[PDB]
């Protein structure tokens, strides 16, 4: 039940929960948990053409405040003021304490580029990563209830069990856990 935890912009993340993180090869952080699981994912897709990447996986406090301030700025930018830009930033980037890159069990992942294109790894992982214990976290049908638009790059640890229900019922985390 501990890789089911919930965090969202209604349910915070408690600041009692510490994660035992290592580091990745590419300096990149995620809890250890999940490591062999992630290790097994990307194996699985190089063994099918696809070579995916970690963009982004543990992130403190301040660095979700960072992409947040990028983010608003982009809007202000664009003629958005400072409420409608911090509104229109929390659709896509969560507020800080609300974001499960806290929780070291989110992983952005990308193509590497010079092997496989974004839209196959993407594809690949819509229908491979259940195996492994991961989620597609926001599908773009599910927007109204996980509160973040369409992020085909964000994935979350489950567990395998976990997974693979929800991808076969087609629901998101926060259906799932809905009795
Ligand atoms: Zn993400």
Redesign the pocket.
């Known amino acids: 039940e501990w890789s089911l935890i919930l965090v969202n912009r209604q349910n915070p993340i408690p600041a009692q929960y510490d994660v035992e993180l290592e580091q990745l090869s590419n300096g990149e952080r995620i809890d250890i948990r999940i490591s062999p699981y992630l290790q097994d994912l990307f194996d699985a897709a190089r063994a099918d053409g696809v070579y995916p990447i970690v963009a982004?996986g543990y992130r403190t406090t301040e660095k979700q405040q960072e992409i947040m301030d990028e983010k608003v700025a982009e809007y202000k930018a664009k003629g958005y003021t400072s409420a409608q830009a911090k509104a229109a930033a929390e659709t896509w980037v969560a507020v800080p304490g609300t974001s499960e890159?806290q929780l070291g069990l989110?992983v952005?992942i990308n193509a590497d580029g010079i092997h496989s294109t974004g839209n196959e790894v993407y594809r690949w992982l819509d229908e491979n990563s259940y195996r492994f214990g991961f989620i597609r976290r926001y599908p773009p049908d599910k927007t109204e209830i996980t509160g973040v638009s369409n992020?085909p790059?964000?994935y979350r640890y489950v567990g395998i069990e976990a997974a693979t229900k929800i991808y076969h019922q087609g629901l998101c985390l926060e259906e799932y856990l809905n009795t």
Do not use: G, I, P
Request: hydrophobic share 30%; proline share 0%.
């Open positions: 982004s890159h989110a952005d992020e790059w964000h």
